[PDB]
From Swiss-Prot, chains A, B:
Assembly: Homodimer or homotetramer; both forms have similar enzymatic activities.
Region Intracellular loop 2 (IL2): start-end pairs: 284-329
Name of this chain's protein: Diacylglycerol O-acyltransferase 1
Residues that span the membrane, as ranges: 21-55, 68-93, 99-121, 129-160, 204-238, 246-283, 330-350, 359-377, 380-411
Region (Extracellular loop 1 (EL1)): 56-67
Membrane topology according to the record: Multi-pass membrane protein
Amino acid sequence: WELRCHRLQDSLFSSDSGFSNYRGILNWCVVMLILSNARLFLENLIKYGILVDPIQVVSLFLKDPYSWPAPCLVIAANVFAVAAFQVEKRLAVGALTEQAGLLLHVANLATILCFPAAVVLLVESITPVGSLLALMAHTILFLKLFSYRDVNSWCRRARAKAASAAAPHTVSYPDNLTYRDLYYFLFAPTLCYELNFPRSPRIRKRFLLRRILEMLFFTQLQVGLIQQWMVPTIQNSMKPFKDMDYSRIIERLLKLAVPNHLIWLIFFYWLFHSCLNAVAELMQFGDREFYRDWWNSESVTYFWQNWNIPVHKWCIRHFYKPMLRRGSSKWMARTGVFLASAFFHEYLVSVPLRMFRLWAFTGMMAQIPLAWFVGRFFQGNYGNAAVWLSLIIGQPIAVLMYVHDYYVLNY
Amino acid sequence: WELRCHRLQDSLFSSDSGFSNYRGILNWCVVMLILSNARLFLENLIKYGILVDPIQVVSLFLKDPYSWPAPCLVIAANVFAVAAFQVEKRLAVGALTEQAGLLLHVANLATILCFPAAVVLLVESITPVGSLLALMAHTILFLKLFSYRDVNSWCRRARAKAASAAAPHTVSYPDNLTYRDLYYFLFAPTLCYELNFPRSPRIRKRFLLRRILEMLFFTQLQVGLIQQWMVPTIQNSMKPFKDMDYSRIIERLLKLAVPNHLIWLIFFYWLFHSCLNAVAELMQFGDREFYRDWWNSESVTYFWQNWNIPVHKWCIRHFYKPMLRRGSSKWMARTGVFLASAFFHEYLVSVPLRMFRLWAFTGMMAQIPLAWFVGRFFQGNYGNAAVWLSLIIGQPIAVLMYVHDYYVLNY
Ligand SMILES: CCCCCCCC/C=C/CCCCCCCC(=O)SCCNC(=O)CCNC(=O)[C@H](O)C(C)(C)COP(=O)(O)OP(=O)(O)OC[C@H]1O[C@@H](n2cnc3c(N)ncnc32)[C@H](O)[C@@H]1OP(=O)(O)O
Ligand SMILES: CCCCCCCC/C=C\CCCCCCCC(=O)SCCNC(=O)CCNC(=O)[C@H](O)C(C)(C)COP(=O)(O)OP(=O)(O)OC[C@H]1O[C@@H](n2cnc3c(N)ncnc32)[C@H](O)[C@@H]1OP(=O)(O)O
Ligand SMILES: CCCCCCCC/C=C/CCCCCCCC(=O)O[C@H](COC(=O)CCCCCCCCCCCCCCC)COP(=O)(O)OCCN
Ligand SMILES: CCCCCCCC/C=C\CCCCCCCC(=O)O[C@H](COC(=O)CCCCCCCCCCCCCCC)COP(=O)(O)OCCN
Ligand SMILES: CCCCCCCC/C=C\CCCCCCCC(=O)O[C@H](COC(=O)CCCCCCCCCCCCCCC)COP(=O)(O)OCCN
Ligand SMILES: CCCCCCCC/C=C\CCCCCCCC(=O)O[C@H](COC(=O)CCCCCCCCCCCCCCC)COP(=O)(O)OCCN
């Protein structure tokens, strides 16, 4: 008799094998990055490890509040973060009938956006990477206060209706309107409010240390990137894109499309994993699903929903499902989310740098002519390559243009 | 009522999430390699696409057989590949009682190894990368003829015993001793013989073309590697390792440990996937399991069994299980496989370069002091980093030493 030892199978790397267990290409990345930067990092963590006075700068800011206006705006955000809580406590019981409460919420939410978009423009002494750290706070606060309105209104209407008729600290409606949990919400790494968030058992000092080291390593890595690889390429030709021709633009962009993409990947891993896990660890949060696998995204429409899960499940719950419930024309809703995304794009990248060329708008617009294209022609492990190319020459380029035209006009 | 939207989960990159679906970090590798070399490759495929006369070189070899001794040896291998088949056909029916047949097989298998190990040493006009392409053929032929002996002997004893008492072309014992299937075995990408191999339906011109392009791209890539990154680093200090001190050796090795590892990874993907899939495609083979996931190998003992599956399932069937069945002391068998692996190492890397420093033997020996260490201390996504480090500063270094000491002594 014969019992065969050769089955009929496929190589693990092959397209039609369906293996998908490459956790270890990832550790190769980590090991190589560490072997290549684990002396420059140990030297920079010394030369900047005692020469940053992390306690004297707060006293120098206390020495003058009107200088350094960026932390001034960040602390000023509490005015809105408290006015909204005050509206909630007002209509929590008997005051401020839903009409007035809703109009007050709309006014407060509008001023959260319109106040820094005015301060950072008029006030001159503000820095671009310091203006961004006020706008990326006054949009997160706006997105959080939107849902803080919505969840409470929904639960309050539910209690109003239940007025027409537990032990495991599951906080009911009115008992969640304390300052402590509002603040815990604001710092929590999520944009969708919810009574009695999940919690994690402990703090896990090890995990927090590893995440802090990831942040301190990746910021140093991409500073190395910006200084060595991308500033020389720019100042070899300090001609700003605002006047160059659509033929020289591309010639000069191909020399930056790769380093740009690399610093964007490093931004993602530094921000959406390491920083948000440090936050969600200190304040025991436990959810920690900030991104799905956007990398193996066979089509771009699937990539748009899996990086930055917080924003996407905020959309799908407070912008999409509400405006399909009491509405229709779902394509109009997809358009609405595209327009809101374009507004926040052109508000976060164009306001701090005071440019309004509306390049990022063309970048967001040219995604649909690319989305339908990739979803129509490519499939599988070539649709994934189409998405990976779109992430190189697509949207991040439309921010590289702004930062290039700014660095050129000033150095 | 409240139905929560925040579960209690972990980030996909985190150690304790168990995601393992990173097919798309891999396509990122492919896309980046292609964007970075997809002009140099299109230029080199032209400058060498018509200036290689792929039909005149066979006529120049026919013009003189004693010059170019490497293809002479490769074609001479058929003497043994036919003597073994003749022994099989002899004792297939009535001649050559098992004693004589076994002794003839032992003699032929010994001369397969001892003949080129003598020709390439004495004959002077032979080149190192041309001597390697005769030794890596006379060991594959030896390993194949071993199992060609064993399978046939086992089936023949089975027929002898069945003498003490179908339709789907399942070839029985004696009808598999034709020249056609012996040759099909020799070129088949496997080292373990088996009557009626699996088969694939068609040839799939697309797949064959993609594999050929992978070969032509990766060889060009690693020639770029050897020329740009590693030859300058060597000829900045042309002092051969044979006399340098154990303190300067390491100082000079750290400048090559990464490029070496990169060309070894490229060797793996060029050889164990692309070339073997091209072969297994032309001759419709269908098995195509030439490697398991050796990358996510949490311990080195698991890496030793999952790269190069052909050799491992040859060991486990013709060297390991036979010598545990009629034997014992399994640790002695693990030692035996280590010793055979060391012999083929020091036979394939040391004979073509005529060096016998027995460095690769220390490299193979220092794996067990490393194997037990990694398996004892590290676990999980840090054991995988231990394995990835062992693959950088471990065995491949012990071949880089040979090739360095050879390139230095000659250029
Ligand atoms: C001008 C300049 C110069 C020009 C250029 C010139 C160039 C010239 C130079 C050019 C360079 C050339 C350089 C060449 C370099 C390469 C040469 C090499 O080094 S080739 C190395 C090949 N190495 C191997 O193939 C691996 C060795 N073999 C293996 O790994 C085997 O698979 C082996 C024998 C080790 C198998 O062992 P186990 O890994 O299975 O371990 P166990 O403990 O023995 O397993 C046996 C039993 O253990 C149990 N077991 C094992 N793991 C278990 C588990 N996880 N759970 C439960 N039971 C388990 C099972 O019951 C298993 O059973 P059951 O064998 O079926 O009877
Ligand atoms: C030297 C000076 C330097 C100084 C520095 C300078 C500083 C400045 C520089 C730089 C700073 C950086 C500034 C710029 C940064 C970048 C800015 C941005 O880009 S802003 C981010 C954009 N983020 C988004 O836009 C998220 C996008 N989110 C989404 O798109 C959504 O998730 C959305 C609405 C698309 C979700 O929808 P869907 O993808 O599911 O679409 P649908 O079809 O509506 O899904 C709904 C229903 O569809 C069905 N459906 C969909 N897919 C299905 C399937 N596969 N099978 C079956 N049914 C399916 C299901 O039934 C689903 O239902 P059900 O409502 O969820 O319960
Ligand atoms: C006009 C230029 C044409 C391309 C010339 C350069 C590339 C030549 C060959 C390179 C080696 C790779 C061959 C094609 C891919 C084979 C593997 C493959 O399918 O990769 C797939 C992923 O890779 C791709 O899809 C890559 C496709 C090409 C992407 C880029 C094409 C447009 C840009 C090319 C020129 C760029 C110039 C840039 C100048 C600044 C999936 O991988 P797998 O799991 O290994 O699949 C095995 C088969 N099921
Ligand atoms: C030789 C001249 C040097 C000039 C100075 C520059 C030196 C530094 C150059 C390049 C370093 C940055 C290149 C990689 C950028 C991507 C970083 C990255 O891995 O982003 C990842 C985020 O992106 C993704 O997950 C999706 C895409 C991943 C693609 C693979 C990224 C790693 C590539 C490594 C390249 C090889 C080493 C380079 C240095 C020798 C985070 O992964 P991780 O940290 O490896 O894994 C976490 C495990 N807990
Ligand atoms: C003899 C001189 C010794 C000098 C000191 C040792 C070298 C220090 C080097 C780097 C320290 C800073 C590393 C920053 C990035 C750390 C990332 C990290 O811890 O990743 C962890 C994973 O780590 C790894 O995969 C490997 C980490 C160890 C790599 C090997 C380091 C020691 C060996 C090389 C040291 C010498 C390098 C320079 C040689 C010229 C967490 O992984 P995950 O998959 O993202 O998540 C699971 C748990 N969340
Ligand atoms: C910007 C210049 C290119 C940098 C690209 C990033 C660094 C290299 C990228 C990825 C390396 C990932 C290593 C994972 C090792 C896993 C084991 C293994 O055998 O991996 C396979 C083999 O990996 C490799 O062949 C990659 C090894 C590193 C090659 C590095 C070459 C650097 C060349 C730089 C050229 C720059 C421009 C020069 C202009 C003169 C994965 O291969 P694949 O082609 O993705 O096959 C899939 C086909 N569907």
